[PDB]
Design an enzyme around this catalytic site. Structure first.
Site, PDB file in Angstrom:
ATOM      1  N   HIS D  53       0.836  -1.226   0.000  1.00 40.81           N
ATOM      2  CA  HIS D  53       0.000   0.000   0.000  1.00 40.81           C
ATOM      3  C   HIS D  53       0.861   1.263   0.000  1.00 40.81           C
ATOM      4  O   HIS D  53       1.533   1.548   0.996  1.00 40.81           O
ATOM      5  CB  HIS D  53      -0.905   0.050   1.242  1.00 40.81           C
ATOM      6  CG  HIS D  53      -1.600  -1.238   1.566  1.00 40.81           C
ATOM      7  ND1 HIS D  53      -2.774  -1.636   0.962  1.00 40.81           N
ATOM      8  CD2 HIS D  53      -1.302  -2.199   2.469  1.00 40.81           C
ATOM      9  CE1 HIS D  53      -3.165  -2.789   1.470  1.00 40.81           C
ATOM     10  NE2 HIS D  53      -2.287  -3.155   2.386  1.00 40.81           N
ATOM     11  N   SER D  76       1.315  -0.833  -5.256  1.00 42.78           N
ATOM     12  CA  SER D  76       0.464  -1.108  -4.085  1.00 42.78           C
ATOM     13  C   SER D  76      -0.042  -2.529  -4.155  1.00 42.78           C
ATOM     14  O   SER D  76      -0.069  -3.131  -5.225  1.00 42.78           O
ATOM     15  CB  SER D  76      -0.745  -0.159  -3.978  1.00 42.78           C
ATOM     16  OG  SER D  76      -0.341   1.165  -3.666  1.00 42.78           O
ATOM     17  N   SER D  81      -5.793   1.511  -1.955  1.00 41.55           N
ATOM     18  CA  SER D  81      -4.974   2.004  -0.835  1.00 41.55           C
ATOM     19  C   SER D  81      -3.896   3.050  -1.098  1.00 41.55           C
ATOM     20  O   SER D  81      -3.351   3.618  -0.161  1.00 41.55           O
ATOM     21  CB  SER D  81      -4.342   0.807  -0.127  1.00 41.55           C
ATOM     22  OG  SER D  81      -3.391   0.165  -0.954  1.00 41.55           O
ATOM     23  N   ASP D 137       3.340  -7.597   0.718  1.00 40.14           N
ATOM     24  CA  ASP D 137       2.267  -7.422   1.668  1.00 40.14           C
ATOM     25  C   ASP D 137       1.030  -8.127   1.105  1.00 40.14           C
ATOM     26  O   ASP D 137       0.356  -7.621   0.210  1.00 40.14           O
ATOM     27  CB  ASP D 137       2.034  -5.932   1.890  1.00 40.14           C
ATOM     28  CG  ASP D 137       0.971  -5.649   2.931  1.00 40.14           C
ATOM     29  OD1 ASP D 137       0.190  -6.558   3.280  1.00 40.14           O
ATOM     30  OD2 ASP D 137       0.921  -4.493   3.395  1.00 40.14           O
ATOM     31  N   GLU D 211       4.784  -8.785   5.065  1.00 43.30           N
ATOM     32  CA  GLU D 211       4.156  -7.907   6.048  1.00 43.30           C
ATOM     33  C   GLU D 211       2.990  -8.432   6.885  1.00 43.30           C
ATOM     34  O   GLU D 211       2.942  -8.183   8.094  1.00 43.30           O
ATOM     35  CB  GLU D 211       3.614  -6.685   5.275  1.00 43.30           C
ATOM     36  CG  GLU D 211       2.984  -5.546   6.079  1.00 43.30           C
ATOM     37  CD  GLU D 211       3.975  -4.660   6.821  1.00 43.30           C
ATOM     38  OE1 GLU D 211       3.510  -3.845   7.649  1.00 43.30           O
ATOM     39  OE2 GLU D 211       5.193  -4.754   6.574  1.00 43.30           O
ATOM     40  N   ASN D 236       5.339 -10.096   9.817  1.00 38.23           N
ATOM     41  CA  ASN D 236       4.111  -9.979  10.563  1.00 38.23           C
ATOM     42  C   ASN D 236       4.249 -10.439  12.016  1.00 38.23           C
ATOM     43  O   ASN D 236       3.759  -9.781  12.916  1.00 38.23           O
ATOM     44  CB  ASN D 236       2.977 -10.777   9.924  1.00 38.23           C
ATOM     45  CG  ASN D 236       1.655 -10.562  10.652  1.00 38.23           C
ATOM     46  OD1 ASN D 236       1.033  -9.503  10.533  1.00 38.23           O
ATOM     47  ND2 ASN D 236       1.227 -11.561  11.420  1.00 38.23           N
ATOM     48  N   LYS D 241       5.402  -5.864  15.566  1.00 38.51           N
ATOM     49  CA  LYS D 241       4.556  -5.707  14.406  1.00 38.51           C
ATOM     50  C   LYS D 241       3.175  -6.227  14.804  1.00 38.51           C
ATOM     51  O   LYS D 241       2.289  -5.427  15.051  1.00 38.51           O
ATOM     52  CB  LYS D 241       5.147  -6.430  13.182  1.00 38.51           C
ATOM     53  CG  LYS D 241       4.513  -6.095  11.836  1.00 38.51           C
ATOM     54  CD  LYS D 241       3.041  -6.471  11.735  1.00 38.51           C
ATOM     55  CE  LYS D 241       2.468  -6.144  10.368  1.00 38.51           C
ATOM     56  NZ  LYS D 241       1.081  -6.683  10.191  1.00 38.51           N
ATOM     57  N   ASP D 245       0.832  -2.931  15.322  1.00 33.74           N
ATOM     58  CA  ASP D 245       0.158  -2.653  14.053  1.00 33.74           C
ATOM     59  C   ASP D 245      -1.245  -3.335  13.956  1.00 33.74           C
ATOM     60  O   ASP D 245      -2.280  -2.665  13.831  1.00 33.74           O
ATOM     61  CB  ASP D 245       1.107  -3.121  12.956  1.00 33.74           C
ATOM     62  CG  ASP D 245       0.516  -3.089  11.562  1.00 33.74           C
ATOM     63  OD1 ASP D 245      -0.661  -3.468  11.369  1.00 33.74           O
ATOM     64  OD2 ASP D 245       1.294  -2.779  10.633  1.00 33.74           O
ATOM     65  N   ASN D 246      -1.277  -4.654  14.064  1.00 29.83           N
ATOM     66  CA  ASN D 246      -2.532  -5.384  13.922  1.00 29.83           C
ATOM     67  C   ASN D 246      -3.592  -5.003  14.949  1.00 29.83           C
ATOM     68  O   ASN D 246      -4.777  -4.879  14.616  1.00 29.83           O
ATOM     69  CB  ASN D 246      -2.292  -6.897  13.984  1.00 29.83           C
ATOM     70  CG  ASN D 246      -1.237  -7.370  12.994  1.00 29.83           C
ATOM     71  OD1 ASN D 246      -0.310  -6.648  12.667  1.00 29.83           O
ATOM     72  ND2 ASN D 246      -1.364  -8.602  12.545  1.00 29.83           N
ATOM     73  N   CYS D 250      -5.339  -0.965  13.968  1.00 34.04           N
ATOM     74  CA  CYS D 250      -6.749  -1.108  13.583  1.00 34.04           C
ATOM     75  C   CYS D 250      -7.679  -0.401  14.575  1.00 34.04           C
ATOM     76  O   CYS D 250      -8.698   0.169  14.181  1.00 34.04           O
ATOM     77  CB  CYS D 250      -7.125  -2.577  13.430  1.00 34.04           C
ATOM     78  SG  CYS D 250      -6.245  -3.414  12.094  1.00 34.04           S
ATOM     79  N   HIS D 356      -7.049  -8.677   4.914  1.00 36.30           N
ATOM     80  CA  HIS D 356      -6.269  -8.298   3.748  1.00 36.30           C
ATOM     81  C   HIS D 356      -7.004  -8.380   2.411  1.00 36.30           C
ATOM     82  O   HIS D 356      -6.888  -7.458   1.598  1.00 36.30           O
ATOM     83  CB  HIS D 356      -4.962  -9.086   3.665  1.00 36.30           C
ATOM     84  CG  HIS D 356      -4.099  -8.651   2.528  1.00 36.30           C
ATOM     85  ND1 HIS D 356      -3.242  -7.576   2.620  1.00 36.30           N
ATOM     86  CD2 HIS D 356      -4.016  -9.094   1.251  1.00 36.30           C
ATOM     87  CE1 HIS D 356      -2.651  -7.392   1.451  1.00 36.30           C
ATOM     88  NE2 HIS D 356      -3.104  -8.302   0.605  1.00 36.30           N
ATOM     89  N   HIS D 410      -3.268   2.885   9.076  1.00 34.61           N
ATOM     90  CA  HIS D 410      -2.727   3.145  10.402  1.00 34.61           C
ATOM     91  C   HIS D 410      -1.902   4.416  10.426  1.00 34.61           C
ATOM     92  O   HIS D 410      -1.393   4.844   9.399  1.00 34.61           O
ATOM     93  CB  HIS D 410      -1.790   2.020  10.880  1.00 34.61           C
ATOM     94  CG  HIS D 410      -2.379   0.646  10.821  1.00 34.61           C
ATOM     95  ND1 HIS D 410      -3.734   0.406  10.917  1.00 34.61           N
ATOM     96  CD2 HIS D 410      -1.780  -0.568  10.845  1.00 34.61           C
ATOM     97  CE1 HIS D 410      -3.949  -0.897  10.904  1.00 34.61           C
ATOM     98  NE2 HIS D 410      -2.777  -1.510  10.880  1.00 34.61           N
ATOM     99  N   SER D 418       6.403  -1.376  12.228  1.00 30.85           N
ATOM    100  CA  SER D 418       6.315  -2.423  11.231  1.00 30.85           C
ATOM    101  C   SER D 418       7.419  -2.266  10.178  1.00 30.85           C
ATOM    102  O   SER D 418       8.091  -3.245   9.818  1.00 30.85           O
ATOM    103  CB  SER D 418       4.968  -2.404  10.522  1.00 30.85           C
ATOM    104  OG  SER D 418       3.910  -2.599  11.422  1.00 30.85           O
ATOM    105  N   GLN D 422      10.685  -4.324   8.564  1.00 29.92           N
ATOM    106  CA  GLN D 422      10.884  -4.552   7.111  1.00 29.92           C
ATOM    107  C   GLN D 422      12.304  -4.213   6.644  1.00 29.92           C
ATOM    108  O   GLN D 422      12.927  -5.003   5.947  1.00 29.92           O
ATOM    109  CB  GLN D 422       9.867  -3.766   6.280  1.00 29.92           C
ATOM    110  CG  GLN D 422       8.496  -4.400   6.183  1.00 29.92           C
ATOM    111  CD  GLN D 422       8.467  -5.595   5.244  1.00 29.92           C
ATOM    112  OE1 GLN D 422       9.504  -6.019   4.730  1.00 29.92           O
ATOM    113  NE2 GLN D 422       7.272  -6.134   5.001  1.00 29.92           N
TER     114      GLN D 422
END
Ligand SMILES: NC(=O)c1ccc[n+]([C@@H]2O[C@H](COP(=O)([O-])OP(=O)(O)OC[C@H]3O[C@@H](n4cnc5c(N)ncnc54)[C@H](O)[C@@H]3O)[C@@H](O)[C@H]2O)c1
Ligand SMILES: Nc1ncnc2c1ncn2CC[C@H](O)C(=O)O
Ligand SMILES: [Cl-]
Lengths: 496, 493, 493, 495
Positions: D53, D76, D81, D137, D211, D236, D241, D245-246, D250, D356, D410, D418, D422
């Site tokens: 994204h 992306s 996105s 991703d 990701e 992930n 991460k 992130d998750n 969210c 996803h 996010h 995250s 990477q």
């Protein structure tokens, strides 16, 4: 808009109407006060009002009052002879109302005019046909055409054709229908063919009717007991400031005016029979006696009969005085009071007249259709009928229509202002309570009267006209007779 | 000459009202039945000046059926009923000079024309009437003023300067009626100055209808200036105590109801004068709820008003609070412009007396800055410029019952007019006794009580009245004849 | 007049959103169902000054279905949603003067136009509204300041000096909103100096939406200067305890997410003011992990914040360490230029109170040598030259939920707006009782608890709320009617 | 760079660069890596293709890889996105060659990805080659590589275009998804240009760093079947991460997505969160934060009990489908909300997915339902009405991940956590490149970053929030059996 759409005799008569309205206003202090007090706040703002009431100069001031309080108005007269054309012209000229009325209408046109008054167009919605929000009625013809219309539509859907009763000239039992019914039915049939949902469609926006006279109230009460009344109703006639002034004192003067204009003879010394000694009959007798007549009363009610006797009047049945009396005045609100057989027994050139709301009191049809009858027009709305066998004649004033409005110009402004102040208050009450009317749930409507507080208020507004100086109770006096210093001063059952 | 009326086509409505009216005019109906064959008035030339109503056309018809030739005119500019006039011309009963809403100038021409007859022996020569039926004295006045004019015309051999001036003896403007009468007299002096005196040789009398005309006769009699015998019809009991009282009781109300839109009930109504007319007016007004307030100059009449429960005041004490004013005095200057300016907004004013003089109509109409509008036929609202207040006058102050309505009903008029026919018959039968050759003075007399009672008898059946007959012993006890008269000559009823 | 909006072609989007919104605006849906036929507002002319969102479009639609004629404008330069305005114009529901991103000058012109009505009789004459729906008090202000201007105008027969100067009594530059209002007032004095006072005769009342507007009404009332009846809608329980609290809990977050790119979790976020709005703001912020710090002047409110686990400090002690600042006081000078100069690099600043006065945006924008860049639509980064430090201000200090987002969602706005419609009906029904003849004093009132509970009842089904009914015995025990009201007047919920 | 790039509008560049600088205030992990490695350039000479994204946050990731010495191509991993101003900033500064824009057609998505995988030979103008490393991703970049290799083997075996690429149906005779048809359209086209393209890229491919959960699932499946063709790093599942992130990402971005797409108030509403894993937990927490009554669905008894412990009702979708107001899928599974479920929902129920792929909701079934009426409510929000019941459902961004379809994903902080993972994974793959022998063994695995590096990512972000960390004394460190410098927890610790 108003001139194009209105149907009146002659717009050029407007100024005479306006000058008269202004003179009448000196005595119509109730209507004057209502205009002063409410012409800005406009308690009837937005209301579409259809009126069916004798369009006299006094009525024009009523219409003017309704207009100043924010209403749009369509008006017609409740009698073929009662409209004063200069009063009608005044309203149209000043854009106060859309008028459908003129003096000496055919019975066919009377019904077309009423139906026209009931027919509205909504400028905010493609000029769709709609009905009035409120009704000012006198005699119940506007209320009748609505209910008979609903009845005609239900019957129409039931069999998917024009009801048979609308297309025949005979009633349930072979008798020739009155011309008024034939003419109303002709309009109802005409409206079924255009839109058979018209009358029922009007019920949605209709919030009430205020009825002026005794005969109209009678009609409202009958519908109410049968559970057929389709809108709220206010009985204006039974306000004290109406029935005890208009019906009585109004007729005391207006009956005489009518008789003086229609009957050339001297009333003094004449035996004049007043049939019915109710509120109207009482005023009539007092007027007649006031000019030297010898009044003979007929009654069905023992209480009213005794009241007449207490005033020095002979009380007889018509059959015992029909051959000897000089003049006959019906004031019963009933039917078949003077028949053709009574007429044949009357002395040479006996005069006959009716002052009740409808012509039904006298068998005018029976007289006009008597085989070999001869008729002469003596003057406008006065006819002499001569029977072929005896060659004797009788003189009927305005074909049995209410004589004070048929042969003269009705009650004077002072009492009409009392009656019409009640009308405005009734209209304001119905409009202001319109939200409370619910058709998706209740459906059953009733007849009510204005409060005694308002009734007394009507009287207060007219005291200065006659220089009446009212006394004020002290605190101790008010408590003693158990009333408020500001009223009401009498119990609900008080008869005055 | 050719009659001058508004419209001959109205004749049928007129004849038809006459027949209905006759149901109650049993006096005139009886005189016709009894005397149409013998025609006691045959050959008589009768000129009449009396409101030409339907009731009057029955009087004319009666004089005609009795054998007289007739010329007629109304004694007021607004009192003629056009259909009644048309009925007379349509059946050749009389030569008529009358219509409703005449100008004052035309009123005098009509009268003058009604007095002008053509010689039954010759053709090109003029003459006058044998008998006169007058109401208010205008026919009688033009005769006397005509003679007075011809005499002073010969003495100074020129037109008398009072006929050419518009001002009176005191430098004040003459009434329009006088100027129009004087205009006619001047014209007749130039056309024929022996006309008025020429009529005297054949004038056997005049029969006068109303109180105001009788007043004029009495003044001429006391001065020794009356030029013909006269019968006072007004003062018969069956005239003054019925017509003046009971007739006005109904006809004033009719006039007010037509002219005044307002309710009479509860209103303070001032009746100025409580004589025979005033009494009837008050009774009628009370009959429909009015609160009557009386004004009077006579202490006796004032006490009578008080005995019927009426407040008795002077105009100045009530002019600002009263609602309606009704003059019934037979006098002048009873309501002045200064009284009118003090009246409340939209106060009503009317006169029921014979002449308009009772109210200052000229002063009202010529008030500086006055504004006037016609409310309806013969009703006017005058507004003063200083106060912006208005007063409403019914038919310019002319007798309201005949100006705004149709006058009294047939019953009482038949009684009044039955007296008129009898008076005409009396003057005619006594014509040999009028001797012109020696300047004898003439007098005013009344009809006998025998005839006065007769008039009443003729109308009893109309109302189903049953009279009682005296026994011979009862008649003796009260000292009267079984057939009357029943009262002494000074009895007031 | 003709409406002035951004783009009429956005109407379909507006209409669709209105329809979706109505799923939750069951108060307004019910008022339309129940009153669209009887029309309790029939003929009333209503001028509205309230953020023209989709939610407001449904309010307007409701007033219209109930019978009123309507003119509308927004009460903020950034709050109008152009597709909502288009829907109203497209359907002829109202004449609108509003668009997103108005200049301050156009804002006052729009309000003035909304207050201007063409007289239905004389098309060539102006009049005002009968009723006003106000939010913040600008409609009420321009009316009162207008009357004041006209009175001062006649007193010295010239344009008042205060309208022709850029300075206030103390020589300080007037706010742009005042200069622009004054500009309009001067223009109307020259056109018609009787405009404002002329409107009073037909004005029956104003219903006020928000706290700040109510404050303004309360000040005028205590000084005896209120010119029309007023209804305080903000203080209905179903308004202040829902819209202000829960509305902001969601719409503050939406405003922040659109304007501030940074994560809220873990940040020190200062909420200035812990009233009805601050309470909701704090709850929403901590719901997404922020550490809320509160400032307060009221010891009771301060204690309440402490009871919810929040630190309570004075701004000075945390202005250098906090990350984000949100003003919710309804006050002024809460964040000054000197406060902003002490904040850390990239500190965010936003206001959720009705007016921008809470933050000294004018002082910031006019700081000498200040550098400004547009980060995105209605988001600006200001960099001070002496420190080289920056602060990021959301929508120039205008209420952020409506300036950087679309305000509260439909459910709570329906509760608030159902109160508005009832207030308007109340004011219209009792219009006859208003009088200016006796020279009376006007007041602020609130809707009854019966109606307040009714608003809540109308919205229970939206959320599947099952309400328990009291037995007759229970009702007597707690001394209430089975149908309510269920709490005393001073109950705080 | 600007030569080949396919973006919407280069003029948006200034706004993109400006947002990047604002975002970097909180992306201290990426800023630190740039500062530490911009001179040594550890990724010098590496060709990196990314399918992730393209937001402002991702631009900072690309900037970081670029500062570290890498040549970059990017696209992306979702059609909705991309932030156009972000893409423009990269193109204007020559940081990378970009094939990406907001609102791509599915056909354009696969062309963009194919173009990002195509490199011009560093020692030849004429010839093409693949990337050295891949930042993926969801696994689409990885998918096209494997499917490309598979398609080339099949093509040579029967010397003709494989028949599964020309038809539009699968084994069952059911219509293929539009993403598969469009991918196959590209794979067929590349066989006709160069049937050795994909196998030729293997020689220089040293690894991929994935990701998200769904991409990892795909990697784990290939690994278990012995079909993974390059080394992989599971990003992930770094603690810094998946647990940030998750969950927390969210918690904020679901709400932003909902507030933009759904006009309704969330308070009091029954909102179903399908799946209570790392994403669902954050979703539920944010929804409750604004007054919603969350109802959870789950297939895992452990996760279901966790939801009950936080006060959430746990039901099967069928028992609440008729009464709930909003439905949010967070399962990473398929066919979670079917057309039949949709037909039972109350008037104007909202539906959205945060997983996803759009597969969680039968979007195709809804769009192709016979007689269905569809209207665009706003950009990427549609109302669908059924002809028999006349009832409607409102779907946010055609079931694509709502936080990036209806909002901008996010916020910077968690993305920096995250993305620091990477960058570290890319460095590890590049640094170990000589340990990949194509001649010897074709047995590749999925590994994760060490706990030392995982804790390091956390250390790099503590100052963003003024976090003050306590230091262990020597005696304390010995008592709990750890080094004063970590790692502080055992490998199986779940945080
Ligand atoms: N943005 C919106 O949608 C929205 C919605 C509702 C109300 N409002 C507005 O929000 C503002 C506040 O409304 P409210 O209902 O919360 O008012 P409130 O009176 O309930 O709360 C305001 C609080 O601020 C405190 N306060 C005042 N001055 C202060 C200062 N200098 N420092 C710290 N605290 C201070 C007071 O003690 C009070 O508790 C008003 O301007 C109102 O009109 C906005
Ligand atoms: N109807 C009438 N006809 C002729 N004259 C009438 C009528 N009514 C009143 N008068 C006036 C005559 C009356 O006798 C009087 O003396 O004035
Ligand atoms: Cl109302």
């Amino acid at each position: 808009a108003y001139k194009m759409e209105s149907r009146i005799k002659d717009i050029s008569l407007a100024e005479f109407g306006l000058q008269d309205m202004e003179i009448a206003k000196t005595d119509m202090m109730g209507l004057v006060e209502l205009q002063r007090k409410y012409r800005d706040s406009k308690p009837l703002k937005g209301a579409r009002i259809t009126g069916s009431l004798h369009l006299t100069i006094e009525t024009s001031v009523l219409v003017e009052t309704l207009y100043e309080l924010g209403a749009e108005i369509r008006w017609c007269s409740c009698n073929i002879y009662s409209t004063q054309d200069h009063a009608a012209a005044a309203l149209v000229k000043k854009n106060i109302a859309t008028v459908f009325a003129w003096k000496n209408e055919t019975i066919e046109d009377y019904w077309v005019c009423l139906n026209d008054a009931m027919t509205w167009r909504n400028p905010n919605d493609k000029d769709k046909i709609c009905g009035p929000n409120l009704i000012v009625d006198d005699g119940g013809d506007a209320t009748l055409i609505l209910h008979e219309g609903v009845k005609a539509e239900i019957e129409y859907e039931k069999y998917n054709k024009i009801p048979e009763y609308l297309e025949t000239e005979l009633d349930e039992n072979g008798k020739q229908l009155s011309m008024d019914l034939k003419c109303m039915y002709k309009v109802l049939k005409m409206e079924l063919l255009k839109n058979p949902f018209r009358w029922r469609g009007m019920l949605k926006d209709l919030y009430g009717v205020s009825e002026e006279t005794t005969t109209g109230v009678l009609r409202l009460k009958i519908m109410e007991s049968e559970g057929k009344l389709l809108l709220p109703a206010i009985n204006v006639n039974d306000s004290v400031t109406k029935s005890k002034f208009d019906n009585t004192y109004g007729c005391r003067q207006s009956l005489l005016h009518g008789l003086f204009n229609g009957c050339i003879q001297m009333l003094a010394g004449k035996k004049i029979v007043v049939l019915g000694y109710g509120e109207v009959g009482k005023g009539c007798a007092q007027g007649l006696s006031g000019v030297g007549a010898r009044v003979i009363v007929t009654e069905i009610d023992p209480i009213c009969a005794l009241q007449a006797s207490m005033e020095g009047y002979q009380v007889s049945v018509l059959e015992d005085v029909v051959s000897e009396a000089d003049i006959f005045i019906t004031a019963t609100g009933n039917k078949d009071v003077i028949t053709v057989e009574h007429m044949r027994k009357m002395k040479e050139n006996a005069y006959i007249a009716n002052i009740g709301h409808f012509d039904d009191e006298i068998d005018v049809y029976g007289l006009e259709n008597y085989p070999g009858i001869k008729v002469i027009e003596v003057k406008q709305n006065v006819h002499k009928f001569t029977f072929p066998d005896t060659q004797k004649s009788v003189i009927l004033l305005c074909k049995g229509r209410l004589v004070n409005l048929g042969c003269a110009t009705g009650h004077p402004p002072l009492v009409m202002s009392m009656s019409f102040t009640n009308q405005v208050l009734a209209q304001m009450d119905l409009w202001k309570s319109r939200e409370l009317v619910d058709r998706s749930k209740n459906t059953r409507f009733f007849v009510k009267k204005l409060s005694k507080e308002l009734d007394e208020y009507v009287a207060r507004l007219h005291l200065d006209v006659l220089g009446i100086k009212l006394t004020k109770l002290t605190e101790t006096q008010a408590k003693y007779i158990n009333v408020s210093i500001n009223g009401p001063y009498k119990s609900e059952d008080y008869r005055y």
